[PDB]
């Protein structure tokens, strides 16, 4: 009955550690201690965007990599021009609790949501000069912490009922539900390819969707704090992962396992956003230390700090180029460094 | 130089900050609340996604957020006050709101965020005390060392029992409150009967002190 | 996405009139807005610009002074004051809409015309003024800046309208390489500085007209001469 079920579940369990034990042989610092350290980076704040009256709490590069969406808790979804500080757009919302911001691929749609439970999808290029919401995508029984675009018609959204959903926008109804957390799914990223995506929740694992099939592939069970952010490797293979245990993890799609432990015995605070870089050497993490961090994504050594905000960092991105990297924090301002 | 339509969107951008800073203007001359209960308590009695509530006494608006909490708690750090709401009639749930206020009270992100303290139950707590059904001592066994103290706020029509009674949850919750507060927020116990108009007065006066704490507070005067 | 425009008439010369655009189905007060007047025999002339918020005023050198451009968002209207009124001012006006933002398509609609009758700048030229074409073929149409429209920051400020005659210009190509909403992609522009061209492949019904190309990197909007196509 349940005893047997749960004698079961604890067998496949220690089975599955055991294959994972066993495919570990050599760890990524052994194989890259013999390489040329990326030594110190100086990244210098280039452009501060000004015009949020409240905590920022996302934002989201184009793919053009010049406008970048942004929200805060004023209400408004606001689109920056990057390289003249100039505000293309600055549009109200209907509820002032935003926590995820979105930028559609095409650049003719832009995403949000936060505790109203509605994905709202707004037009961006349209007629009568003004964006208008396009689509409010209801049915998440909990405040929505992440959206992505998988394309200008479908949408991937987690939120804290512990569950992800696809979205066909044209429809308005979800396509697909991702079950199998038990916590709050706090964020979600993507893959370069877009067919599969990595969510990280409150019960401290990182599960792997295949959007097409709809199933949980792999879960990654390394932190012992929620996981507040997510993001894929450049290559697809890979992704890092930060929680509140003030630890930064890379994971593999192939070898199931962690790589790398990113923490500091003078890190305390825990992470709030994660990216990386166009090669995906630096690993950025944004903390509630009011400053973000730069690691080596192959030696797991510090590069620098970029602190200059006097608040937490609560939102990052890096341009599709890799020029830039914007960051917004709990004091209104966004800064991209170079 | 800039072009031509690089100066128009300039332009567009400035009228852009002008209606930004219009809206931030309009937008800071109202108190934010954050509602909060556990069930039964009345949350919604107390002023007669998300349900949002606005309400203006002595010509200023007060915003009323309830939510129906580690996570979604974190988004209310710039509001004015956490309005906590206690069903006092039971005692079985007691100690569960007390365990609650004790979260929220220490809340990493509420550490700057005064409460104001309903108390929602006044005559089902008299009609609970005076009953003698339930031993309130049996849930509490603190009453033997609890005595009522020499100074007292009592009400004309008042039975010592209750009033003791009544003393003895409001202690038991600003204990809590004055454990680990460093002096950065301060708990405003109040005491409603679900039927008391004077509620909102009660509320935009704790919110006037709170303001002129914060003033206090980061003009160097505290 | 409605310019309807009224005023105009017979106007003895010295006299005033006033003539006004209605917009409609847009938002009015977030676009900047043009007075645009082509001569019955000549081609298109921008005449005055009237910024977003009133702000930012504008007028051709030919009319400063005696034209007076203004815009009422509450009302969702465009006026356009005239004194001392001249024979080489009678014309046919229009109210055009363009909106200036990163991406934005500046001249997207132009409403249709009011006839007048009264009774430093950069130089764009076409060098072919009508061209014989048939339907199916390739065309290709070119004109020149007198200085190159390219800016520092890598924007080449031209735009290509088409007449259709019997209709109101209409915008196809902006920035001298995007392509305008809801027109076909056979049309496709390219170029230089002070070299730029149009193509047309495989023209179909409702394509012959005469085509402009102008400039928005100065304020003045020098116009092409225009080049007509006939079957």
């Known amino acids: 009955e349940l005893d047997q079920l749960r004698q079961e579940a604890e067998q496949l369990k220690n089975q599955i550690r055991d294959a994972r034990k066993a495919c570990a042989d050599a760890t990524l610092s052994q194989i890259t201690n013999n390489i040329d350290p990326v030594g110190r980076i100086q990244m210098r704040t280039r452009r501060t965007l000004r015009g949020h009256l409240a905590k920022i709490y996302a934002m989201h590069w184009g793919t053009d990599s010049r406008l970048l969406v942004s929200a805060s808790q004023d209400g408004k979804l606001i689109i920056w021009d990057s390289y003249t500080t100039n505000k293309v757009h600055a549009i109200p919302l209907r509820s002032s609790w935003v926590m995820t911001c979105a930028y559609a691929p095409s650049g003719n749609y832009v995403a949000c949501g936060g505790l109203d439970n509605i994905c709202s999808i707004y037009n961006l290029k349209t007629r009568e000069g003004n964006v208008r919401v396009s689509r409010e995508l209801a049915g998440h029984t909990g405040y929505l912490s992440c959206c992505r675009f998988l394309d200008d018609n479908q949408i991937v959204t987690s939120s804290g009922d512990t569950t992800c959903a696809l979205w066909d926008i044209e429809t308005g109804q979800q396509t697909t539900t991702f079950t199998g957390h038990t916590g709050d799914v706090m964020s979600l990223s993507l893959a370069p390819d877009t067919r599969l995506f990595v969510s990280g929740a409150c019960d401290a694992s990182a599960k792997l969707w295949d959007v097409r099939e709809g199933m949980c592939r792999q879960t990654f069970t390394g932190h012992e704090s929620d996981i507040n952010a997510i993001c894929f490797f450049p290559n697809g293979n890979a992704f890092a992962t930060g929680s509140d245990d003030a630890t930064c993890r890379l994971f593999d799609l192939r070898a199931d396992q962690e790589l790398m432990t990113y923490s500091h015995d003078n890190i305390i605070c825990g992470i709030t956003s994660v990216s990386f870089s166009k090669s995906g050497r630096l690993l950025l993490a944004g903390y509630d230390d009011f400053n973000c961090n730069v690691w080596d994504a192959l030696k797991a050594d510090r590069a620098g700090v970029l602190a200059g905000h006097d608040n937490r960092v609560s939102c990052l991105g890096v341009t599709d180029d890799g020029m830039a990297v914007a960051t917004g924090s709990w004091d209104s301002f966004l800064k991209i460094w170079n | 130089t800039v072009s031509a339509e690089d100066k128009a969107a300039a332009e567009r951008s400035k009228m852009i900050d002008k209606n930004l800073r219009e809206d931030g203007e309009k937008a800071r001359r109202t108190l934010r609340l954050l509602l909060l209960g556990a069930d039964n308590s009345g949350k919604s009695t107390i002023v007669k996604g998300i349900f949002e509530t606005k309400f203006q006494v002595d010509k200023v608006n007060f915003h009323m957020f309830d939510v129906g909490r580690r996570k979604w708690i974190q988004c209310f750090n710039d509001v004015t006050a956490i309005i906590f709401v206690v069903d006092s009639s039971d005692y079985n749930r007691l100690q569960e709101a007390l365990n609650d206020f004790k979260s929220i009270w220490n809340n990493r992100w509420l550490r700057t965020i005064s409460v104001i303290l309903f108390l929602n139950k006044q005559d089902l707590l008299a009609e609970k005390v005076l009953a003698g059904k339930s031993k309130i001592e049996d849930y509490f066994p603190e009453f033997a060392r609890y005595t009522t103290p020499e100074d007292a706020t009592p009400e004309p029509g008042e039975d010592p029992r209750v009033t003791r009674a009544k003393y003895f949850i409001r202690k038991e919750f600003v204990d809590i409150s004055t454990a680990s507060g460093d002096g950065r927020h301060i708990c405003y116990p109040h005491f409603t009967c679900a039927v008391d108009t004077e509620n909102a007065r009660r509320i935009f006066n704790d919110c006037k002190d709170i303001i002129l704490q914060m003033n206090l507070r980061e003009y160097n005067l505290v | 996405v409605q310019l309807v425009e009224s005023g105009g008439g017979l106007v003895q010369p010295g006299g005033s009139r006033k003539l006004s655009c209605s917009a409609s189905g847009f938002a009015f007060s977030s676009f900047g807005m043009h007075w645009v007047r082509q001569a019955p025999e000549k081609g298109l002339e921008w005449v005055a610009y009237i910024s977003s918020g009133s702000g930012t005023i504008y007028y051709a050198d030919t009319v400063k002074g005696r034209f007076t451009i203004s815009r009422d968002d509450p009302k969702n209207t465009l006026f356009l004051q005239m004194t001392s009124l001249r024979s080489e001012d009678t014309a046919m006006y229009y109210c055009?809409?363009?909106?200036?933002?990163?991406?934005?398509?500046?001249?997207?609609?132009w409403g249709q015309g009011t006839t007048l009758t009264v009774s430093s700048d950069i130089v764009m030229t076409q060098a072919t003024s009508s061209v014989p074409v048939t339907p199916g073929e390739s065309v290709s149409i070119s004109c020149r800046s007198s200085k190159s429209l390219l800016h520092s920051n890598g924007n080449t400020y031209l735009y290509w309208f088409l007449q259709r005659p019997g209709q109101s210009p209409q915008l196809l190509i902006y920035?001298?390489?995007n392509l305008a909403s809801g027109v076909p992609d056979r049309f496709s522009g390219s170029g230089s500085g002070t070299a730029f061209t149009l193509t047309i492949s495989r023209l179909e019904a409702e394509d012959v007209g005469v085509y402009y190309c102008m400039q928005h990197l100065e304020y003045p909007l020098t116009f092409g001469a225009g080049t007509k196509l006939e079957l």
């Open positions: 055009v809409r363009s909106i200036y933002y990163y991406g934005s398509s500046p001249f997207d609609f």
């Open positions: 920035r001298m390489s």
